[PDB]
Amino acid sequence: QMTQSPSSLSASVGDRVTITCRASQSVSSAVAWYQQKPGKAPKLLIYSASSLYSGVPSRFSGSRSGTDFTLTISSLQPEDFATYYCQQSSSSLITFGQGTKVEIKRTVAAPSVFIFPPSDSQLKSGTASVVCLLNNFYPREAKQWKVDNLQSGNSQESVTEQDSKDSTYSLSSTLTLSKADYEKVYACEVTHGLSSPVTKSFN
Amino acid sequence: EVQLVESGGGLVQPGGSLRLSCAASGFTFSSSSIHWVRQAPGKGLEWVASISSSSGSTSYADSVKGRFTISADTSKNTAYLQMNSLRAEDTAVYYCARYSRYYYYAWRVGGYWGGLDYWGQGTLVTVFNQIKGPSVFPLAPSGGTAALGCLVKDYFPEPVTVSWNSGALTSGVHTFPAVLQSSGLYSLSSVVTVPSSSLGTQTYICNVNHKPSNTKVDKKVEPK
Amino acid sequence: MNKQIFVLYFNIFLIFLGIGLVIPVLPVYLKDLGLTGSDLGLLVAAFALSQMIISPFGGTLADKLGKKLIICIGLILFSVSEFMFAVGHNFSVLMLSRVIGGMSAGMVMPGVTGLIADISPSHQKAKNFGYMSAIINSGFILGPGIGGFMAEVSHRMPFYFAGALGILAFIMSIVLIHDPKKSKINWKVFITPVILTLVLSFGLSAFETLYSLYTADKVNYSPKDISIAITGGGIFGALFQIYFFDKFMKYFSELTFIAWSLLYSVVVLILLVFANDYWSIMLISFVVFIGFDMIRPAITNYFSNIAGERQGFAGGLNSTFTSMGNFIGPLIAGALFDVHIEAPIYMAIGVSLAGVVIVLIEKQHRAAAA
Numbered sequence: 141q142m143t144q145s146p147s148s149l150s151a152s153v154g155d156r157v158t159i160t161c162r163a164s165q166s167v168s169s170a171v172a173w174y175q176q177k178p179g180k181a182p183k184l185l186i187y188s189a190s191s192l193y194s195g196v197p198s199r200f201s202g203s204r205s206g207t208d209f210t211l212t213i214s215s216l217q218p219e220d221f222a223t224y225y226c227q228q229s230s231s232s233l234i235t236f237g238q239g240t241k242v243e244i245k246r247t248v249a250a251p252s253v254f255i256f257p258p259s260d261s262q263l264k265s266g267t268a269s270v271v272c273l274l275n276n277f278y279p280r281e282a283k284q285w286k287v288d289n290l291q292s293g294n295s296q297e298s299v300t301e302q303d304s305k306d307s308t309y310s311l312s313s314t315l316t317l318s319k320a321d322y323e324k325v326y327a328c329e330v331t332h333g334l335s336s337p338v339t340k341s342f343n
Numbered sequence: 344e345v346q347l348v349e350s351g352g353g354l355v356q357p358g359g360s361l362r363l364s365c366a367a368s369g370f371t372f373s374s375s376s377i378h379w380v381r382q383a384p385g386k387g388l389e390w391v392a393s394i395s396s397s398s399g400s401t402s403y404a405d406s407v408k409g410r411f412t413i414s415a416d417t418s419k420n421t422a423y424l425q426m427n428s429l430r431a432e433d434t435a436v437y438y439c440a441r442y443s444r445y446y447y448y449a450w451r452v453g454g455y456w457g458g459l460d461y462w463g464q465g466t467l468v469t470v471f472n473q474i475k476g477p478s479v480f481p482l483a484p485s486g487g488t489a490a491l492g493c494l495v496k497d498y499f500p501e502p503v504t505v506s507w508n509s510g511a512l513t514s515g516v517h518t519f520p521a522v523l524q525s526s527g528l529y530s531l532s533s534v535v536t537v538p539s540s541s542l543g544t545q546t547y548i549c550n551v552n553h554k555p556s557n558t559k560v561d562k563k564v565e566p567k
Numbered sequence: 568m569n570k571q572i573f574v575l576y577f578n579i580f581l582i583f584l585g586i587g588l589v590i591p592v593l594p595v596y597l598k599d600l601g602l603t604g605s606d607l608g609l610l611v612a613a614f615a616l617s618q619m620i621i622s623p624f625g626g627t628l629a630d631k632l633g634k635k636l637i638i639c640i641g642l643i644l645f646s647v648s649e650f651m652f653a654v655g656h657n658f659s660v661l662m663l664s665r666v667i668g669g670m671s672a673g674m675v676m677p678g679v680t681g682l683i684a685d686i687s688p689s690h691q692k693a694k695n696f697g698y699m700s701a702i703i704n705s706g707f708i709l710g711p712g713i714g715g716f717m718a719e720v721s722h723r724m725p726f727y728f729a730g731a732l733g734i735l736a737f738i739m740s741i742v743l744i745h746d747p748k749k750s751k752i753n754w755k756v757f758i759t760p761v762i763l764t765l766v767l768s769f770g771l772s773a774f775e776t777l778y779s780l781y782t783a784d785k786v787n788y789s790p791k792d793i794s795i796a797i798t799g800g801g802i803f804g805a806l807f808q809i810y811f812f813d814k815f816m817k818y819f820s821e822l823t824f825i826a827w828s829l830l831y832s833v834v835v836l837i838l839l840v841f842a843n844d845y846w847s848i849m850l851i852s853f854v855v856f857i858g859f860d861m862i863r864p865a866i867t868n869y870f871s872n873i874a875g876e877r878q879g880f881a882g883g884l885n886s887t888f889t890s891m892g893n894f895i896g897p898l899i900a901g902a903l904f905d906v907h908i909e910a911p912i913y914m915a916i917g918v919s920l921a922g923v924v925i926v927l928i929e930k931q932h933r934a935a936a937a
Contacts, residue, residue, distance in 0.1 A: 197719060446901060
């Protein structure tokens with residue numbers, strides 16, 4: 141409900157992070173800060189304090205700069221990798237921030253590309269779904285489906301969250317086709333992490 | 344010290360009404376209010392409603408005004424959110440939270456600290472009721488380690504659980520978040536890796552549960 | 568007297584500086600110790616409750632065993648509490664520190680008030696009490712400023728500094744306060760001043776504590792604007808407390824002056840409600856606290872006058888009910904403020920009118936008696 145910058149950032153343990161929340165210009169009250177980890181309720185991280193008192197150095201410090209607010213984490217401890225929200229109150233309503241996610245950095249990893257043919261029951265179902273998967277790669281940014289040597293629009297991409305103890309991602313790209321189109325080789329190319337794009341093919 | 348417990352969430356019809364309850368206990372030296380905040384799956388936090396413990400004054404979001412009504416009864420210190428004419432964008436996890444403000448007098452200066460101090464566990468509310476069962480297709484694995492998995496398709500709504508060997512195998516299992524297809528139905532896949540030498544040692548089973556349909560299926564994954 | 572009165576003023580300044588020292592560093596303590604909001608509310612309540620309970624007994628003991636001894640013990644307690652907060656890494660240690668600080672305040676304030684009343688010539692008491700109120704306000708102002716300035720190295724340095732200052736004040740009081748030369752019970756003369764101070768505190772702390780929130784939510788006041796308004800109001804109030812309060816005391820009586828100050832306060836508060844401009848709010852804020860700033864020394868003087876040889880007891884009663892009002896005011900005010908932005912000003916106007924009624928009733932009773 142309020143703009144937060146960045147939408148998502150990655151940093152290493154011990155680094156200093158700043159999250160900027162763009163607050164309302166109709167009120168000048170302070171902003172509260174909340175922290176949420178996956179699968180659990182949000183937790184109040186910083187109270188909304190009096191306008192006279194904001195700026196005392198601390199591990200989690202709130203600072204008002206003009207109309208914007210800033211949450212600063214001086215030391216990135218391992219257990220404060222979560223999503224951060226800013227909240228502003230008014231006469232009667234409450235506005236939340238868009239949300240900034242903080243992720244843990246690590247060394248660049250390569251994905252284990254796999255391709256899967258449609259199953260027999262899938263063939264009998266009347267539609268063919270072919271999935272290409274990338275496993276255990278850290279840099280989330282990864283890019284295609286080729287049929288007999290390039291289509292777009294008819295594909296679905298799902299990426300997992302960061303691993304709890306490994307800190308890598310998994311990506312699944314599913315291409316769905318009708319039987320007339322499917323029966324008439326297949327391959328998926330991944331661009332990453334990798335010196336050259338990796339193509340996995342089947343027939 | 345204070346505890347907030349949500350109840351009353353579940354499957355509802357796209358147009359029906361549903362009542363959420365927040366039971367609150369505990370005392371604090373603060374001015375307090377009870378708020379409702381929803382989180383759509385994969386989305387952020389959205390404030391929906393609020394009511395004051397003393398001199399109960401309500402407040403609602405613009406996107407929820409008219410359809411929702413918040414109330415409280417102080418006999419058992421309970422709050423209620425009654426939502427009517429539920430629409431597509433009303434499927435979310437709803438938390439009840441306690442806004443607390445503490446005061447410290449010092450002349451014309453002095454501190455106050457306010458925020459949503461305490462939160463509930465949250466209750467899921469799914470508005471769509473076009474319930475249909477899922478379809479499960481195996482992924483044939485056939486190096487040092489291969490991968491195999493389940494593909495669940497055309498299920499709705501989207502509470503779905505995927506497990507391997509009834510939860511015995513919990514290493515190297517990635518269940519991708521559900522996605523919406525062009526037909527208005529959900530599809531996901533779950534992939535687990537296994538060393539190629541272990542492919543024939545033990546057959547792999549895949550348990551797929553769709554709670555709204557009460558559909559529990561087991562699919563065996565074997566190499567082609 | 569100019570050396571005894573100075574050390575008494577320093578003691579009262581130290582107490583009220585220690586009161587406000589904790590505001591800038593409370594969230595840091597909460598995060599460092601992993602304390603909940605219930606803990607924050609308890610930490611706020613403990614000091615006020617301890618002062619409420621201790622103040623009348625502290626004043627009675629000052630009357631009985633001598634004021635200098637009670638003041639010195641209160642300074643010892645102040646130093647102990649400040650050091651306990653400086654080194655406290657547990658919630659129980661922090662709560663004990665707050666309790667000891669409240670007890671120290673309830674011992675020091677009644678004793679200092681009683682001693683300043685005792686060592687003052689009859690024609691100088693009002694001036695001394697106006698000076699005392701100005702000193703109390705200055706301590707309130709300077710508390711958070713020093714607390715936030717000295718928290719840039721550590722959030723515990725302010726309390727080490729405050730404990731050291733308490734040690735110095737105790738030594739100065741032992742050396743400089745003269746040892747006593749030599750040496751009512753009716754609960755009917757104290758009813759009207761305690762009711763007046765309680766009602767006025769309850770309604771005025773409501774407006775004082777929520778002033779910044781109200782100005783931010785009404786006219787969009789940046790922190791520097793709120794600082795400007797607060798400093799202007801404080802300057803005007805101090806100027807009236809130091810220079811004009813005693814002149815008003817010779818001309819008028821205590822009750823007549825209190826009634827006129829309350830009527831002025833009502834008028835200016837009403838003018839503040841109907842103001843929505845930036846400069847209008849600033850100009851009204853500059854002068855909206857003058858009558859309230861002069862009511863406190865007037866109530867202290869009234870307590871002193873109606874008492875006999877129980878000046879310490881009068882100081883203790885004043886402390887107890889002032890702190891009770893100052894604690895209960897903002898809690899109700901914020902709840903009402905959640906439903907309307909003008910609620911704290913309405914409470915201030917209501918308690919001002921009630922105080923006018925109480926003062927008039929007591930004046931009529933006095934006239935009927937004579």
